[PDB]
Amino acid sequence: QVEALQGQVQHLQAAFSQYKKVELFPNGQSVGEKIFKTAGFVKPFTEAQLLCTQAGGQLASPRSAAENAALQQLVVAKNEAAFLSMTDSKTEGKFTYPTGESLVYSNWAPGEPNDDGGSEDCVEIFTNGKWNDRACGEKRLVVCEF
Amino acid sequence: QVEALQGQVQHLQAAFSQYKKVELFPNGQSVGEKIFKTAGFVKPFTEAQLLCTQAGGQLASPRSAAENAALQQLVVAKNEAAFLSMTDSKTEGKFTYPTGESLVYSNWAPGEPNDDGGSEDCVEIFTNGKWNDRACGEKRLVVCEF
Amino acid sequence: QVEALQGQVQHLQAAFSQYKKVELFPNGQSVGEKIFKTAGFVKPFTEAQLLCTQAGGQLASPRSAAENAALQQLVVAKNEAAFLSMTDSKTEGKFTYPTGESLVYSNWAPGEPNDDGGSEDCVEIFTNGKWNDRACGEKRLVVCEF
Ligand SMILES: OC[C@@H](O)[C@H]1O[C@H](O)[C@@H](O)[C@@H](O)[C@@H]1O
Ligand SMILES: OC[C@@H](O)[C@H]1O[C@H](O)[C@@H](O)[C@@H](O)[C@@H]1O
Ligand SMILES: OC[C@@H](O)[C@H]1O[C@H](O)[C@@H](O)[C@@H](O)[C@@H]1O
Ligand SMILES: [Ca+2]
Ligand SMILES: [Ca+2]
Ligand SMILES: [Ca+2]
Ligand SMILES: [Ca+2]
Numbered sequence: 190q191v192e193a194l195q196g197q198v199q200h201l202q203a204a205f206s207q208y209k210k211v212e213l214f215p216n217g218q219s220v221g222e223k224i225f226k227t228a229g230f231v232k233p234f235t236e237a238q239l240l241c242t243q244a245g246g247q248l249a250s251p252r253s254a255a256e257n258a259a260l261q262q263l264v265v266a267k268n269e270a271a272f273l274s275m276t277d278s279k280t281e282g283k284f285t286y287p288t289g290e291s292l293v294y295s296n297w298a299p300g301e302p303n304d305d306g307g308s309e310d311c312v313e314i315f316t317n318g319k320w321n322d323r324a325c326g327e328k329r330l331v332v333c334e335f
Numbered sequence: 336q337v338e339a340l341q342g343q344v345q346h347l348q349a350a351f352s353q354y355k356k357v358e359l360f361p362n363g364q365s366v367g368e369k370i371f372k373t374a375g376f377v378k379p380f381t382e383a384q385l386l387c388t389q390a391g392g393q394l395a396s397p398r399s400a401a402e403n404a405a406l407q408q409l410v411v412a413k414n415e416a417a418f419l420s421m422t423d424s425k426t427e428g429k430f431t432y433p434t435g436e437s438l439v440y441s442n443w444a445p446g447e448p449n450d451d452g453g454s455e456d457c458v459e460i461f462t463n464g465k466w467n468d469r470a471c472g473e474k475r476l477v478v479c480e481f
Numbered sequence: 482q483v484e485a486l487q488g489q490v491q492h493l494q495a496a497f498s499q500y501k502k503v504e505l506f507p508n509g510q511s512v513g514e515k516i517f518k519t520a521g522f523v524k525p526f527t528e529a530q531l532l533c534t535q536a537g538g539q540l541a542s543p544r545s546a547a548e549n550a551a552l553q554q555l556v557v558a559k560n561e562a563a564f565l566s567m568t569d570s571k572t573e574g575k576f577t578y579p580t581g582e583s584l585v586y587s588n589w590a591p592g593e594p595n596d597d598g599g600s601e602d603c604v605e606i607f608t609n610g611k612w613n614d615r616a617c618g619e620k621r622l623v624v625c626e627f
């Protein structure tokens with residue numbers, strides 16, 4: 190019996206692993222325990238944020254070079270800059286994750302963030318992986334993390 | 336062995352939970368034990384019906400307000416009215432599920448169904464969640480349930 | 482604690498089966514233990530091949546009439562001819578899989594392969610399921626197998 194349950198769990202592990210690859214192709218990227226997935230279209234920050242939260246996740250929040258590289262692959266594939274989850278909407282000059290925590294990693298392009306026009310509280314990631322603070326009202330690729 | 340086998344099932348459960356969220360974003364919606372998934376494009380009723388059946392499911396068949404609201408979320412997201420599986424092709428005035436049973440739930444807009452032009456045997460759901468009988472030849476968003 | 486796990490596995494099995502069908506709709510097709518999935522866009526051969534390999538799979542490689550029929554379903558649904566993995570880049574006239582192994586199945590359209598222009602080393606599958614050797618530089622629907 191204990192062995193009969195083995196044959197099942199074993200089959201499940203194999204089937205699940207195959208299904209995982211299928212699911213991630215071509216809009217997902219796995220990095221560590223995190224999975225990034227793009228919706229394939231653009232939206233303003235507030236709408237992008239809501240879409241990810243309702244899906245049980247949150248906007249892409251790269252916390253390391255490895256995660257940022259994984260996210261970058263999606264941006265390049267779609268050739269569309271994407272929104273990150275971080276903003277300095279609460280306190281200008283201080284970017285935070287949705288929880289309020291301060292950034293543990295950043296990859297700002299030279300000179301950024303610069304709050305251009307005194308109205309850039311959101312963050313976009315370019316095809317080169319670099320970050321730029323941009324107006325939250327702009328529309329960018331929606332990428333959520335799970 | 337149980338000790339280790341429990342660790343495997345626990346890993347599968349956790350991994351699967353994550354992947355379910357990933358899979359449903361952004362074209363799926365879970366409600367109870369039913370899952371709605373949109374193909375993202377429009378098709379006439381017959382073509383839409385065949386796509387769903389060949390995929391191992393059937394056209395969206397909301398049987399409760401909760402299921403209807405879940406379906407509505409997809410229709411709103413794609414901003415395209417979708418076909419439901421029910422029709423009154425067999426007997427005019429009596430809408431049934433693909434199996435033949437009569438409806439157990441309905442959310443008709445006022446005055447519907449009205450068999451306009453004496454030729455509306457299919458059903459579409461609007462972005463406001465209401466139903467309208469419509470010509471089966473029209474093209475509407477394809478949403479299947481599994 | 483035995484019946485405990487057995488219960489969880491059965492239910493995990495059922496949930497996985499449902500998510501499998503949801504996953505394949507509308508861009509995937511399962512045949513045997515193989516799964517075909519289209520990216521939904523076209524790319525030149527090398528780029529397409531790279532996308533599949535990086536995803537942990539490879540370009541569509543139908544090895545039987547059954548596999549070819551399943552692949553043809555996706556080509557028909559997308560209405561776009563797709564690249565297969567096989568090429569005769571090494572030895573003109575001799576088509577092989579990425580491993581170097583010779584074909585074990587083929588469905589060449591009448592008059593094919595003809596190496597037209599003296600430079601057609603890749604293979605495409607039409608909506609009718611037939612194959613045609615085509616210049617690897619052309620762009621065709623990307624379909625991987627897992
Ligand atoms: O609204 C200004 C933006 O379009 C960007 O213009 C220039 O690239 C730089 O000033 C950026 O920092 C700014 O976000
Ligand atoms: O064929 C007529 C339809 O386009 C719809 O026209 C009006 O909105 C109402 O008569 C509807 O009931 C009808 O389905
Ligand atoms: O470059 C020519 C291709 O477009 C194909 O056109 C026709 O299908 C046939 O001549 C094929 O052999 C050719 O590869
Ligand atoms: Ca500000
Ligand atoms: Ca700012
Ligand atoms: Ca800026
Ligand atoms: Ca009628």
Ligand SMILES: [Ca+2]
Pocket residue numbers: 423427428450454455456457468
């Ligand atoms: Ca009618």
Ligand SMILES: [Ca+2]
Pocket residue numbers: 447448449450451455467468469
């Ligand atoms: Ca009507």
Ligand SMILES: [Ca+2]
Pocket residue numbers: 569570573599600601602
């Ligand atoms: Ca050649």
Ligand SMILES: [Ca+2]
Pocket residue numbers: 569573574596600601602603614
């Ligand atoms: Ca050739």
Ligand SMILES: [Ca+2]
Pocket residue numbers: 593594595596597601613614615
């Ligand atoms: Ca040819």
